[PDB]
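#dry-run=false #mode=assembly
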Amino acid sequence: GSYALGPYQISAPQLPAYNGQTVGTFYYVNDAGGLESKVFSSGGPTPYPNYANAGHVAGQSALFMRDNGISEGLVFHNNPEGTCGFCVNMTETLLPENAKMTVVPPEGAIPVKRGATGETKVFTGNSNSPKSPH
DNA sequence: GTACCGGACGTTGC
DNA sequence: GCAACGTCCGGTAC
Ligand SMILES: [Mg+2]
Ligand SMILES: [Zn+2]
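#status=ok
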């Protein structure tokens, strides 16, 4: 399908085959009207190791939106197992208040473990901010 | 190499 | 109310 982001109607872009590391592409709209994109990769150092979803594509996207003050965003990833239950329950925490970010798993995704979902999830950030690690 | 630990948030089962 | 459970993660004990 095609998802709306401001005035744009964007579909899923080409992503590398899932090798074991989840790679994703994140789209937003700049303070002018143009469409910008950034690639996020699983792993890497995170400022919140106390949140199990901070190392994921959805968590890195949420933290990016919080840092750069982005209100709307749209991310596509390539993980066939879907979006983990952590990213389901803690994204709105990580996300700044009233920020809208939809996470689109690859089409045809099949969850395996508990909490993982294969459908699109539209998160709405809550007034809660992430707890400091120390 | 395998096997756990662990913060943290909401869900499910009891 | 409480126990298990969820990583795309590192880190620690065998
Ligand atoms: Mg929040
Ligand atoms: Zn996740």
